[PDB]
Design a protein around this motif. Structure first.
Motif, PDB file in Angstrom:
ATOM      1  N   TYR A  15       8.158   8.553   7.559  1.00  0.00           N
ATOM      2  CA  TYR A  15       8.795   7.356   6.727  1.00  0.00           C
ATOM      3  C   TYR A  15       9.936   6.663   7.381  1.00  0.00           C
ATOM      4  O   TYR A  15      10.127   7.343   8.349  1.00  0.00           O
ATOM      5  CB  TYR A  15       9.085   7.525   5.212  1.00  0.00           C
ATOM      6  CG  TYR A  15      10.695   7.881   5.167  1.00  0.00           C
ATOM      7  CD1 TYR A  15      11.874   7.944   5.782  1.00  0.00           C
ATOM      8  CD2 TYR A  15      10.767   9.390   4.894  1.00  0.00           C
ATOM      9  CE1 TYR A  15      12.844   9.166   6.038  1.00  0.00           C
ATOM     10  CE2 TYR A  15      11.779  10.293   4.799  1.00  0.00           C
ATOM     11  CZ  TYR A  15      12.582  10.056   5.307  1.00  0.00           C
ATOM     12  OH  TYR A  15      13.701  11.018   5.377  1.00  0.00           O
ATOM     13  N   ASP A  31      -2.830   2.155   4.023  1.00  0.00           N
ATOM     14  CA  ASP A  31      -3.610   3.046   3.009  1.00  0.00           C
ATOM     15  C   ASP A  31      -4.393   3.866   3.594  1.00  0.00           C
ATOM     16  O   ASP A  31      -5.092   4.417   2.674  1.00  0.00           O
ATOM     17  CB  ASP A  31      -4.592   1.757   1.792  1.00  0.00           C
ATOM     18  CG  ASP A  31      -5.236   2.759   1.233  1.00  0.00           C
ATOM     19  OD1 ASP A  31      -5.694   3.597   0.682  1.00  0.00           O
ATOM     20  OD2 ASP A  31      -4.203   1.896  -0.660  1.00  0.00           O
ATOM     21  N   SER A  44       1.078  -0.838  -0.126  1.00  0.00           N
ATOM     22  CA  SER A  44      -0.291  -0.589   0.125  1.00  0.00           C
ATOM     23  C   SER A  44       1.027   1.482   0.163  1.00  0.00           C
ATOM     24  O   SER A  44       0.859   2.052  -0.905  1.00  0.00           O
ATOM     25  CB  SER A  44      -0.721  -0.365   1.374  1.00  0.00           C
ATOM     26  OG  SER A  44      -0.333  -0.720   2.191  1.00  0.00           O
ATOM     27  N   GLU A  45       1.538   1.868   0.389  1.00  0.00           N
ATOM     28  CA  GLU A  45       2.636   2.705   1.483  1.00  0.00           C
ATOM     29  C   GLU A  45       4.214   2.068   0.983  1.00  0.00           C
ATOM     30  O   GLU A  45       4.293   3.731   1.432  1.00  0.00           O
ATOM     31  CB  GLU A  45       1.941   3.046   2.324  1.00  0.00           C
ATOM     32  CG  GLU A  45       1.206   3.525   2.903  1.00  0.00           C
ATOM     33  CD  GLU A  45       0.459   4.892   1.758  1.00  0.00           C
ATOM     34  OE1 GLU A  45       1.386   6.058   1.669  1.00  0.00           O
ATOM     35  OE2 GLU A  45      -0.531   4.749   1.110  1.00  0.00           O
ATOM     36  N   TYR A  75       5.958   5.369   3.754  1.00  0.00           N
ATOM     37  CA  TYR A  75       5.611   6.440   3.901  1.00  0.00           C
ATOM     38  C   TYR A  75       4.604   6.101   4.910  1.00  0.00           C
ATOM     39  O   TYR A  75       3.525   5.362   4.997  1.00  0.00           O
ATOM     40  CB  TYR A  75       4.726   7.243   2.803  1.00  0.00           C
ATOM     41  CG  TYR A  75       6.481   8.182   2.208  1.00  0.00           C
ATOM     42  CD1 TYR A  75       6.570   7.997   0.721  1.00  0.00           C
ATOM     43  CD2 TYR A  75       7.405   8.023   2.502  1.00  0.00           C
ATOM     44  CE1 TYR A  75       7.089   8.108  -0.339  1.00  0.00           C
ATOM     45  CE2 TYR A  75       8.422   8.472   1.678  1.00  0.00           C
ATOM     46  CZ  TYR A  75       8.562   8.763   0.828  1.00  0.00           C
ATOM     47  OH  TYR A  75      10.060   8.325  -0.434  1.00  0.00           O
ATOM     48  N   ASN A  76       4.313   7.837   5.429  1.00  0.00           N
ATOM     49  CA  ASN A  76       2.914   7.252   6.124  1.00  0.00           C
ATOM     50  C   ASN A  76       2.946   8.752   7.429  1.00  0.00           C
ATOM     51  O   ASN A  76       3.680   8.453   8.116  1.00  0.00           O
ATOM     52  CB  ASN A  76       2.462   6.237   7.144  1.00  0.00           C
ATOM     53  CG  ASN A  76       1.479   6.011   7.747  1.00  0.00           C
ATOM     54  OD1 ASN A  76       0.917   6.872   9.097  1.00  0.00           O
ATOM     55  ND2 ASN A  76      -0.242   5.218   7.360  1.00  0.00           N
TER      56      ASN A  76
END
Length: 537
Positions: free
Chosen positions: A335, A383, A287-288, A308-309
């Protein structure tokens, strides 16, 4: 018949593979030409080893079945693209059949018969095998271009292996009649027995398998030639590439003892056991996750994987997981980065690099339910789909992933699924609870948690207000509100694993080319199309 392009979820030796029906059958019939039984316009190829999901015609329950044979016709005529309101799509020939309903019963309806509004059978849930999987990084890297494993090496503690390679090679050569019996012959002869190649005995020994011994010899011949010494860490060293054509021969019993990675970087065990942590980590990546490489100072490549998040807690989880596998990690602002080369290679060959190439690794589908859910949780959380204001909405530029997701969801009970392709991007709508996401399934209940009013109306005679949920249905029966003699006809629909979706639009076209089919043991039905639609064989 089905069109070449159609997605087909299939199982090969207990592993789920998503393939376009045509490509599968085409290849299978090329590498088995001699076995094909032609009939002018029809080519049949009996096979074994292939299984596909199907529903029991009687109980309508989801079960896997054997694929008796692959079939290829040379078609010319009208083809239909069936689009179901749920977003599922399937392209079939005119005479091909799907399942619809007629007086509370599942009947076969052909393509040229189907019209908008018609109800079509679709999965509510699927039963895929559950087993533990073990990733083998050697087999993984072998399927990688040599350019990518240039700086990869396999090390092994020189401790209990004082010149083991040379000592073994001399024993092998002795066995092959090219050298005098070594002094340490028996030490190695035992190992060869442990491997089952040689059966030691009173007198001397007896070679049980010459072919295997030849390959083993070939392996040690390569090792003795390329194995270096790493005085620093007192360990043996070997460049992966220099032994790419022999390493696969190494028995797992011996692989365990090695480590694989870079010389002055991270190295990990070549055999990884799949657990909920790996799955979730992979979930985050799909997802990320983004994998990249740049030239760095001295022109030559530096590999990294960033997750990333924005959410701080998430980053702590990814970091906790990432590090649990790749040792020291780099926690950034928004991240978590893994600057290890073996880490990049692992993620790349498992889930893909580009967004449209993103995919769920094969092993996940037949892992225990716990691992599947762990994967899903990681995908969702990353996500950013934990707190829903409406319903979960996943996006992917990867068509495969969209399909793989629907199968995964289906495999763990989730049936309230909708698909969409609004603009180069595929959307997957989920309108029902998940063990890690609190949401109301009763809110705007999807086709899957509802019994069509047409079906009720036709069965009971009355004219039903609107749709009814399986629960309300069960209750009305235990009230006399619904005649229990008729309500039983519809039991398959309340207890089976098949739900009804409605045809939204039908496109008719002319097609000149190949069309495919499958013969499935017992049930004579399987899953095909975007979103998966049950098709009669």
């Amino acid at each position: 018949s089905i069109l070449p392009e159609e997605w087909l979820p299939v199982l090969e030796e207990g592993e789920v593979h998503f393939v376009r029906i045509g490509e599968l059958i085409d290849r299978m019939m090329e590498e088995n030409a001699g076995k094909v039984k032609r009939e002018g316009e029809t080519e049949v190829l009996e096979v074994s080893g292939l299984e596909v999901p199907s529903f029991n015609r009687r109980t309508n329950k989801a079960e896997l079945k054997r694929v008796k044979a692959l079939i290829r016709h040379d078609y010319s005529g009208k083809v239909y693209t069936i689009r179901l309101k749920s977003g599922r799509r399937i392209k079939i020939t005119s005479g091909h059949s799907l399942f619809s309903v007629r007086n509370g019963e599942l009947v076969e309806v052909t393509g040229d018969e189907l019209k908008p509004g018609d109800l079509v059978a679709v999965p509510r849930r699927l039963e895929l095998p559950e087993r533990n999987h073990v990733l083998n990084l050697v087999e993984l890297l072998l399927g990688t271009p040599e350019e990518e494993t240039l700086d990869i090496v396999m090390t092994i503690p020189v401790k209990g292996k004082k010149n083991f390679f040379k000592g073994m090679l001399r024993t092998l050569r002795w066995i092959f009649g090219e050298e005098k019996r070594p002094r340490t012959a028996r030490r190695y002869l035992r190992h060869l027995e442990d491997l089952g190649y040689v059966r030691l005995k009173k007198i001397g020994y007896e070679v049980l398998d010459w072919d295997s011994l030849k390959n083993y010899r070939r392996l040690y011949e390569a090792l003795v030639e390329n194995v270096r010494y790493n005085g620093n860490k007192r360990e043996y060293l070997v460049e992966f590439n220099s032994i790419r054509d022999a390493v696969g021969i190494m028995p797992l019993k011996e692989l365990k003892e090695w480590k694989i990675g870079t010389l002055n970087g991270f190295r990990m065990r070549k055999l990884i056991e799949v657990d909920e942590s790996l799955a979730k980590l992979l979930g985050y990546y799909v997802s990320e996750g983004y994998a990249r490489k740049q030239r760095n100072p001295k022109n030559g490549w530096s590999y990294s994987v960033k997750l990333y998040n924005e959410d701080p807690e998430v980053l702590d989880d990814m970091e906790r997981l990432a590090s649990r596998f790749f040792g020291k990690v780099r926690r950034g602002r928004n991240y978590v980065e893994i600057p290890k080369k073996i880490g990049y290679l692992l993620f790349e060959n498992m889930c893909g690099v580009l967004a449209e190439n993103k995919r769920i690794p094969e092993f996940v589908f037949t892992s225990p339910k716990g691992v599947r859910l762990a994967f899903l949780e990681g995908y969702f959380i990353g996500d950013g789909d934990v707190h829903p204001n409406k319903r979960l909405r996943l996006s992917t530029k990867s068509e495969l992933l969209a399909n793989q997701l629907v199968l995964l969801l289906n495999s763990v009970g989730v049936s309230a699924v909708k698909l969409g392709h609004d603009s180069g991007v595929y959307r997957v709508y989920i309108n029902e609870e998940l063990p890690f996401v609190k949401l109301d399934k009763k809110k705007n209940a999807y086709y899957s948690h509802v019994i069509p009013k047409e079906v009720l109306s036709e069965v009971f005679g009355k004219v039903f207000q609107k749709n009814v949920s399986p629960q309300t249905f069960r209750k009305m029966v235990e009230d006399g509100r619904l005649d229990p003699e008729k309500a039983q006809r519809l039991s398959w629909l309340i207890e089976g694993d098949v739900v009804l979706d409605r045809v939204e639009s039908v496109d008719v076209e002319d097609y000149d080319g190949y069309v495919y089919d499958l013969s499935v043991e017992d049930n004579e039905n399987f899953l095909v199309g975007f979103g998966l639609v049950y098709a009669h064989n």
